[PDB]
Amino acid sequence: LDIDPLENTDFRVLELYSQKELRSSNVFDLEEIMREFNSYKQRVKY
């Protein structure tokens, strides 16, 4: 009986879609709409 012992394997944390790739996926980005709003909200100079 020569049974080889089972090797320890290190499961990695698997990242399918990147974070920067996740919000990159929405047609409507609230962050840049609210921002686009206050950018408009500052259009008056005399």
């Binding site: 790739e21 996740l22 990159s24 996926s25 929405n26 047609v27």
Partner: protein, 43 residues
């Protein structure tokens, strides 16, 4: 009574990064302020 294909693998995502492209927007902005006039104090 005594008694596994090998290969090379490439995996592919579904891709979710929405397509960007720039858009030109043409428009005009008409503004109407209105005021009164007495002595030197414009209302």
């Amino acid at each position: 009574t005594s008694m596994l294909d090998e290969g090379i693998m490439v995996v592919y995502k579904r891709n979710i990064v929405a397509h960007t492209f720039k858009v030109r927007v043409y428009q005009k902005v008409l503004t109407f302020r209105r005021s009164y006039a007495y002595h030197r104090t414009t209302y």
